[PDB]
């Protein structure tokens, strides 16, 4: 079926939970043996969210190459994304090592450091120009260059230096700051505006390594971001945009990381975002 009318048909019939459970039942199951090794327990935020072995990002290290991060490679859309958990106190150096080694231009953050009164990820970037951060375990230096605070999101320019080679690179930090503590946003308008700002920066384009996108677990809000982006790109590429099937695209993405889209409300929000976004594109 088309999307907008399939949408109203699920609303009128109140069957979002049943649609979402079908997706959960059909989703791929692949091994995640490296994630579960005892030496990696303090590298995982949640025991039930792990990268598959076949798609995990490897750190360029011989001691321990593990990080909780996955490469989502969308062949028809010609887009790639790295989805990862919010960094932990003992993985902030690994996080920036990955950004460096994978040649990423942008980092997309969809959570606040504190939500619901609890810490959802480490404070992993510097908040003042004159107070830079050094990660001694991976030999990197990170400096805040500029910050632009808007009503729904903040964009930061960061300088990452590899202290071993003295090479430097400019990284863009795109921080969506207004996702509610509970539920999903009422309108997709600010989320779509944010997606378009990431696109306009070049961070999603083939001349760079894959964008790094995270929330707390790296599957819920993060899944919504890449699902919406890929579906809108396919609607621009195909002769028949009504042929784009958001459930099929989501199941393709779940071949590369488990659990993408965590609730039926996130599924409905993803539909809403693609529907409204397709009208603005034209
Ligand atoms: O593609 C874009 C776009 C291009 C340039 C700037 O934005 N958008 C904007 C937001 N959209 C909405 O429907 C908002 C609810 C108004 C549609 C998608």
Instruction: Residue 83: name the closest of 251, 254, 214, 248 by CA.
Output: 214
Experimental technique used? X-ray
Could you write out the DSSP letters of every residue in 83-134?
EEPPPPTTTHHHHHHHHHHTTB-EEEE-S-SEETTEE-S---S-SSTTS-EE
Return the beta strands (E) in the chain as ranges.
Answer: 56-58, 66-74, 79-84, 106-109, 114-115, 118-119, 133-135, 140-149, 153-162, 167-176, 211-214
**Annotation says 215 is catalytic:** yes
Write out the CATH class of domain 1-282. alpha beta
Confirm or reject: Cβ of 189 under 6 Å from ligand 1: yes
Q: What is the resolution of this structure in A?
A: 1.7
106-109 and 211-214 as β-strands: parallel, antiparallel, unpaired? Answer: parallel
List the catalytic residue out of 121, 215, 226, 231: 215
Numbered residues of the known binding site for substrate: 181, 215-221, 262
Q: Which residues contact 220 (CB under 8 A, 6 or more apart)?
A: 259, 260, 261, 262, 263, 266
């Amino acid at each position: 079926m088309e999307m907008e009318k399939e949408f109203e048909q699920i609303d009128k019939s109140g069957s979002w939970a049943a649609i979402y459970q079908d997706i959960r039942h059909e989703a791929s199951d692949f091994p995640s043996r490296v994630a579960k090794l005892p030496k990696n327990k303090n590298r995982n935020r949640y025991r039930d969210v792990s990268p598959f072995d076949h798609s995990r990002i490897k750190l360029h290290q011989e001691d321990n190459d593990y990080i909780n991060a996955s490469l989502i490679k969308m062949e028809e859309a010609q887009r790639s994304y790295i989805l990862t958990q919010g960094p932990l106190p003992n993985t902030v150096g690994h996080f920036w090592e990955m950004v460096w080694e994978q040649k990423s231009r942008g980092v997309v953050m969809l959570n606040r450091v504190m939500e619901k009164g609890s810490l959802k990820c480490a404070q992993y970037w510097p908040q003042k120009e004159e107070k830079e951060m050094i990660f001694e375990d991976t030999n990197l230096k990170l400096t805040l260059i500029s910050e632009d605070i808007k009503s729904y999101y903040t964009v930061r320019q960061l300088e990452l230096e590899n202290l071993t080679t003295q090479e430097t690179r400019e990284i863009l930090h795109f921080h969506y700051t207004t996702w509610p503590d509970f539920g999903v946003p009422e309108s997709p308008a600010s989320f779509l505006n944010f997606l378009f700002k990431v696109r306009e920066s070049g961070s999603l384009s083939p001349e760079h390594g894959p964008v790094v996108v995270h929330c707390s677990a790296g599957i819920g809000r993060s899944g919504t971001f890449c699902l919406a982006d890929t579906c809108l790109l396919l609607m621009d590429k195909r002769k028949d945009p009504s042929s784009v099937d958001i459930k099929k695209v989501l199941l393709e993405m779940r071949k590369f990381r488990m659990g993408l889209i965590q609730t039926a409300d996130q599924l409905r929000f993803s539909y809403l975002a693609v529907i409204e976004g397709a009208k603005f594109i034209m």
